[PDB]
Ligand SMILES: Cc1ccc(Nc2cc(C)ncn2)cc1
Ligand SMILES: [Mg+2]
């Protein structure tokens with residue numbers, strides 16, 4: 001109980017900021033995650049031995065793909081930590097517990113392919129889950145790991161608290177399906193603007209947690225430019241491989257996924273910032289003012305992509 005995780009001074013300070021990069025030392029990422037649980041939740045939220053065994057089973061079930069990997073899981077969990085730490089009184093005990101775990105598990109066993117490619121390939125998972133195919137699989141993998149012996153980190157919860165936290169995790173993980181984000185954000189925009197947004201309404205909380213999950217999942221676009229730019233290479237490495245697999249099925253991929261159309265990447269990033277990222281962080285900042293730094297960083301990176309197009313870099 002008296003065993004705190006501490007980080008080196010530079011990490012201890014920078015981990016509190018939204019734009020923190022977890023670094024290239026894979027063996028420090030479990031300790032970074034536990035440090036965040038302990039400060040975000042409490043040293044008592046989880047049995048350290050069960051938590052450590054849960055983390056290492058989660059790690060083992062992420063694959064060696066360029067982007068949707070163990071580093072992404074921990075990066076997405078850090079963005080949730082930053083949001084929760086800047087919005088101390090807004091979230092229940094169960095939510096803080098559930099949401100950091102949801103973020104760590106949100107892409108479990110990702111193969112580097114979109115829901116679209118699974119459907120066109122006719123992957124078995126596509127027959128098992130018609131919509132949010134990979135996200136229903138990620139939640140399934142999470143429950144599977146929670147049921148390994150010595151891995152049930154929620155064992156101290158009551159029967160009703162247990163069902164509540166697994167429901168928080170399920171909705172949070174499903175919400176990382178970008179196809180569901182567009183309608184969710186529009187509904188939240190309308191509710192904020194007409195003044196009907198009510199955080200005591202459970203349906204409303206669910207929507208706000210969904211937007212937080214999109215915000216954390218996209219948080220590559222809220223880092224300092226050198227991080228954002230290098231992460232884009234990993235993102236497009238997956239997209240281009242999916243494009244190659246589309247061509248093998250006899251289907252011309254969308255230009256975003258076609259490695260023959262790399263020249264179009266700068267303009268594709270503009271579309272993505274304007275259609276997805278900026279709208280996402282704008283609505284989030286309206287609902288949770290202390291997340292403005294995510295919007296500010298996203299805007300700075302849009303301006304950097306505009307400079308790439310103008311040949312200034
Ligand atoms: C499946 C998936 C969806 C969105 C992202 N984030 C992105 C996307 C793009 C186009 N540019 C930068 N970041 C990554 C993966
Ligand atoms: Mg995902």
Ligand SMILES: [Zn+2]
Pocket residue numbers: 072076106107176217
């Ligand atoms: Zn993700």
